[PDB]
Amino acid sequence: HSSPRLFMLSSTSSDALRQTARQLATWVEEHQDCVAASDLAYTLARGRAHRPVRTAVVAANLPELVEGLREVADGDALYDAAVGHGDRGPVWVFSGQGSQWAAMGTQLLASEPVFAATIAKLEPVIAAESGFSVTEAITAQQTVTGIDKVQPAVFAVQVALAATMEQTYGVRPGAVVGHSMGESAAAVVAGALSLEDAARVICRRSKLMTRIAGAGAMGSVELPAKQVNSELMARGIDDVVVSVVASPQSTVIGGTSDTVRDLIARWEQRDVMAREVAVDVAFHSPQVDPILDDLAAALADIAPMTPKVPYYSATLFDPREQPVCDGAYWVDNLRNTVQFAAAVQAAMEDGYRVFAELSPHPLLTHAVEQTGRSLDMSVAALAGMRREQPLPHGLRGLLTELHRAGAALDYSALYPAGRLVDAPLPAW
């Protein structure tokens, strides 16, 4: 086909990668009438051992590739080395609510058939459970609002992103990590729940949460949780608690609206980065207590399964423990502190270095980076999509970033067949 293709290139340094690009451009220019673009793309991806310093050039024809390669070769870009060794798959990070944006699903429904098929599977389930069209919600000209609509819509995008990455791009996750509602998508992707049961979990919990709207407020602070708890105790505050522990240096408090706003104002006056979070309930606090018995009863029929992928729990006291995703688990998930930093730390200690957030917009990439920095590790925290980002070739860009960062993937999904061509082989 004369469609744009992905040509992978790699070396040991930024200067050596430029020399590699120059050698390839000269060869492609001399053999363009003899080499099929598909064969060359296949050879570069499947017939070359990928070296630590990676890049990729997109091109529809061989003369377009020569321009792109010469642009690389002439440039002065610093290409970071891969943090993974093609040994482990990426860790999918499923964040909480707040990532939603207007018509967030439109481009992916048109460009990604597996994204569209996953939203089609969820459509009748979310309609029966929550009384609304999730396809209309993610394609509307106005951002989804109301906890009962936001959580199923964000969960739907999350799971459709994961399915596309595995089925279309051959990226099987090495592990999963969820944050609050993100754990429903993490459970589907890890095989702990069926897509339908996880949808029931997110639909039922968000419907019950509308009953407790206007309860209080939440706020993020760039202070470690032990320090935040010490300050609340010192001040005699029992109406505000540490609700989320996202990084060794980041914390989210939740409680009464006036005390939370006063605490944020006080931190700001000390030049401490504090921010109010848009919510009217303080989740992961005693404010959710009234709806927990009803939630346990709503989820009495959820059929949990043994996870097939490492699932780093932000609910359990041990993140390495494999969850029994029953109704009790989802009650604890809503009421207990989100121990996200602990879960990320455990995955990083176990050897995972490539994290990719499968969400409509990145909410926890800084949190992942902060944990890596505290462990003195070189990690990659990627974003699956960003608010208002054009996705003309679907998730192919995320695949390129996962490849560049060193995540283990199946090259036969993107490059299923071709002939190994006698393209240049550089020494190291």
- Long-range contacts, 257-262 (Cβ 8 Å, 24+): 257/216, 257/217, 260/216, 260/217, 260/218, 260/219, 261/217, 261/219
Sheet holding 250-255, edge to edge: 240-247, 250-255, 217-221, 274-277
Evaluate the CA torsion angle 88, 350, 369, 315 in order and state its sign: positive
CA distances to 129, 151, 231 from 92, rounded to whole Å, are: 26, 18, 34
Residues with active-site annotation: 180
- Rounded to 10 deg, the angle between the 340-349 and 365-374 helix axes is 50
Contact by Cβ (8 Å): 371, 177? no
State this model's resolution in angstroms.
2.8
Find how far residue 352's CA is from the centre of its chain: 14
The span from the CA of 175 to the CA of 71, in Å, is: 37
Geometric angle at alpha carbon 107, from 157 and 100, rounded to 5° = 40
CA distances to 27, 29, 380 from 32, rounded to whole Å, are: 8, 6, 36
